[PDB]
Amino acid sequence: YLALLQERAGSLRDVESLQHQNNELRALLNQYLSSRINDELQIPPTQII
Amino acid sequence: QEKVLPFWNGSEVDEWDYLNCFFRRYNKALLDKTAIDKEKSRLERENADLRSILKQYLDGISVNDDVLNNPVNPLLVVNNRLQITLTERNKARA
Amino acid sequence: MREIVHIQGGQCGNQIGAKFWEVVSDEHGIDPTGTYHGDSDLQLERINVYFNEATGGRYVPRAILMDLEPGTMDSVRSGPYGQIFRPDNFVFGQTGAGNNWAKGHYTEGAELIDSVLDVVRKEAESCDCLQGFQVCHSLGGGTGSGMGTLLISKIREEYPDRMMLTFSVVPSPKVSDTVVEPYNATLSVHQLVENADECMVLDNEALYDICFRTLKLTTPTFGDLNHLISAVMSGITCCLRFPGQLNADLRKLAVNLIPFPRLHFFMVGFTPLTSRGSQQYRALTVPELTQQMWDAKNMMCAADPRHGRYLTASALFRGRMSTKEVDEQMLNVQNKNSSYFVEWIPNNVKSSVCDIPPKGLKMSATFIGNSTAIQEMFKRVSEQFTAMFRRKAFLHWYTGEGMDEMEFTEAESNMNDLVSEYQQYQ
Amino acid sequence: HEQQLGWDWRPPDD
Amino acid sequence: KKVEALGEALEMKEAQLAEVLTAANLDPGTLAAINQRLEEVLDNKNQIIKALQYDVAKVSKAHNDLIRVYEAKLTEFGIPVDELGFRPLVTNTSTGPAG
């Protein structure tokens, strides 16, 4: 049971770190989705994707 | 939570059913850890998806060898490949 | 009156203690033959703190060597100043420690520690009014931690009224000597935080960084490192040997430093440490000795105080100086670096002044801090422990000698709660 | 017993 | 079998909801919004029930443990008169809410 508790604590810390990284990545992606080069092209990467 | 309620939400005791409350606590810990695992399992896959979309977006801006190598690319179009791909994606995402 | 018995555990502790005794003999002015050939009487006024008049001036140190091999013992005898210790105190087994905590705390400990207690008790009863114990060892080996730590525990149980200084060379990640250093460090701090009264923690990483930056040495062998550790352990307690304008006993230092009975790990440095070349240019007055004292790169510990907070500091000056100058130095340092200091302790610095500077130097100082950033070493060692304890690596060499997993988990939990206790206050 | 899993604890006679 | 009975109840209630909505055919927006704000009311009710039940349990445990610790201190000091009786607590152990 104690081994299980230790594994749970490790998993919780990993989940927290992963959520942090995901939030940072999503913020960066939203930053890219609004740029001068995003509109100055005759073909937008938004439509390309 | 389980520091103040480790047991749940009168004759003598037999050895087989002797540890049932402890197994209740053990099962509570197992359920919580399984929930942790499920949450993580969704987080890493969503993170990977975000990484992929970010990478292909940066490719969309840049002028790169793989951008040219991908036959479906606005940078250089041959035989309406890009237009066919766009209409296929439109009908698939409709 | 007051005196200190000394013990040198293991090879590292033995060599550090040998250099310490050379330094002390130089400061007190005695020959390697044991005779007195100093200059002034202020040194022989109070040699009974470390030495005993044997027969017509042949002063004998009050220290006991301790290891499990004869090679190191022969080396210390053959080295200079090694012809002064009492041969009745060269206690040592023969089998071999094997750098194993079990082999130094459960078998060879059980086969030699009755004898080591017998000799140390003989010395502690020969000396009249005890003041404390002094022990030198490393927390990365088998007989450094096993032998020395069991000796610490037994002596604490037998004389539980004497202040105890254990000087611990904690392992440092970059200078990785052996493979079981984290295991030994964990199993040693588990007992130190519970029995011993204060350990001064040192590390080879900072002991090398100091030699490369401040000393500007080219090839520093272990002689220079042991020299620095000596010069620290010599000035840790000078108010006993020499008079002072504001004396400070060891118990006074302990009570001023340790706020709670479980926060007694001291990170220590020495000043001045001037390179052989730039010394002729350098200026040595109090408001630069103090600047180098609080310089984060002079600390003999790879834990930058800018990564934590200070609970208490102790500055022991040596030489004829200005007490008001010292006090204004400490006050303005606190006001300049208020952030690095704890709020609920006014005047976090305890200052002491002794009237006799060391050999040659005209002014000197020693710094002993109780910063909460020292949790970094324990956190790192615990991480290195749990990197191996998940897979039980190198664990059968202790399991076969008779230690379960229960005490390993106990020691790791002890480290974790110690880190928590440092972190909570900060 | 009383902490982990007893639900009842009874002393012996002597 | 209790789970099976509750599943049957869920199935019949869901079918009744489906037929009622397909019969009424009212506009989605306003009726949906009605649904969400009383759903929120119900959800907050359930959450506060859970939290306050846990609060009762926690305060009762702290109460009983502190009673025992005062009794122990007084009987150690030799004060022989004990006054208060323990409340019907379910879980007894060392924990945080004592000092």
Add this chain to the structure above:
Amino acid sequence: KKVEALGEALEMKEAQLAEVLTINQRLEEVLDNKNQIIKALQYDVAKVSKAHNDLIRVYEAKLTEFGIPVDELGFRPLVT
């Protein structure tokens, strides 16, 4: 866990039935029952907290009446 989840699902589904029927009076009476449960439960919390404070008072009075310990020693009790 499945039982409790099914129970709450049943309750919410009945709530949707009641609201889309316009039954609702019964749903609001159930809600009033829940509110009065809230009231009784928080009143019990108030009772136990006040009794906790009262026993702190009686114990400090008992200690001070003999005076053999001073008012406070060692640990400090927490107050709700």
Add this chain to the structure above:
Amino acid sequence: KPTIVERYANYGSGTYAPLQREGRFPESKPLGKEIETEGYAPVTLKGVVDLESFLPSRLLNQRKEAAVQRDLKAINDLLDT
């Protein structure tokens, strides 16, 4: 310094009220590495059935041997005789 059993039996009936003077505070984490698993628990039957789906395996249910076999064979033959 008491034993663990004595320490647990002394305070209350299985508890411990640490005095604020010692400074040993293990019952309260420094709030940095705090633990709270209440949010992760499922609130809907969809989550319940998903957790049920997760991990069904745990849900459901040499030379030394040769030497020992040799020794037992020899001793069995001796008993037969």
Add this chain to the structure above:
Amino acid sequence: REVISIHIGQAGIQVGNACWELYCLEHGIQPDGQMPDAFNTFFSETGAGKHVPRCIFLDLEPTVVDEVRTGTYRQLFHPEQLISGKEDAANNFARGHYTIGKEIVDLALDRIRKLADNCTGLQGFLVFNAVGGGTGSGLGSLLLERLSVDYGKKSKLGFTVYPSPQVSTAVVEPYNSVLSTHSLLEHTDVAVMLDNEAIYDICRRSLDIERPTYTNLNRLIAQVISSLTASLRFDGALNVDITEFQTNLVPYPRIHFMLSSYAPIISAEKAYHEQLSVAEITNAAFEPASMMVKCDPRHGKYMACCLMYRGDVVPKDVNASVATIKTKRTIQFVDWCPTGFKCGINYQPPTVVPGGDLAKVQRAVCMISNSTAIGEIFSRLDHKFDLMYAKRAFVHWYVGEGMEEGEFSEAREDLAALEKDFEEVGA
């Protein structure tokens, strides 16, 4: 502090023939046994300046034992330890373990015990053998089992030679090695592994010789043994002994098969030009071409490595070099141990043999490492044994000489289990 040395079979005693020359050169003992404390580990003193080794050389064929009985070292040894049987085991495990093995082991053991009694403080046994043949494999297995039964707790180091992956002399050495692992795994405590082809390639690359005889191999293995035992005799900054080896290099009970390497293994004409400071000899001790065993460490991970520096070494350049090794990328330690190194230094510089191939180098490094890069060797030997065991080939000899079937069944399953154990401890 003393260690006993036993040499079984042609390869073991031939290696010892250079080991004792190297030891006498180190300690200044003349071949007859005179010198015109530091030797106590390897020699016992008596007479008017006379020293005799703590070794036994035992073999069945007397053809090679006569060579040491007559060749310039007759006065060195005790003229009883040179055991000689009556006829060779003929590469036959059953002839070396069951037929003839039961007749010389008594005289061998009753001599080992009295040498141990003479020894002041026992600290280890070290056994030289090659599993490529009957006389080595079978008899060494029997004797190692007997020693494990008798003494037990004392350390044992098997300096064992496996056959090369393709450069193979015997035809039955797959059988013999598979049948000898049953003891080399379970009875010895530390196995120091060799391979002829690796030394061939090492001396072809660095020692620039294309036709190396057995003399070169024996010399550059005797150098490794001397560098291993230098810490017991001489003084050093961080002396490391046999129990240190055991406690640091054996993470699990059934994982003890460690590689070896030596650097600089350099000529006499490149020694002046090419520089041999610590920061580069440490790197030169880690390339896969400098391993004394024909294995590729890039195919696995390093569990634990141990370094011994003889000569002029300061303990800071070792730290810098280990830091560089860890920061390197072409190698990858097992994620188990952060502190994966066992440093050790000495003070006696490497001892050149006059007329030899190596040179008077100021310093040298011997590295022994435990890594998962040996499951490949075990698997290849298992495969090349199973294929010959398929058609029931060469087995009638062993059948008529004492083996029946259970030996092969249990050896095969044991090797399978060992390979699976390495696989599962890998990741």
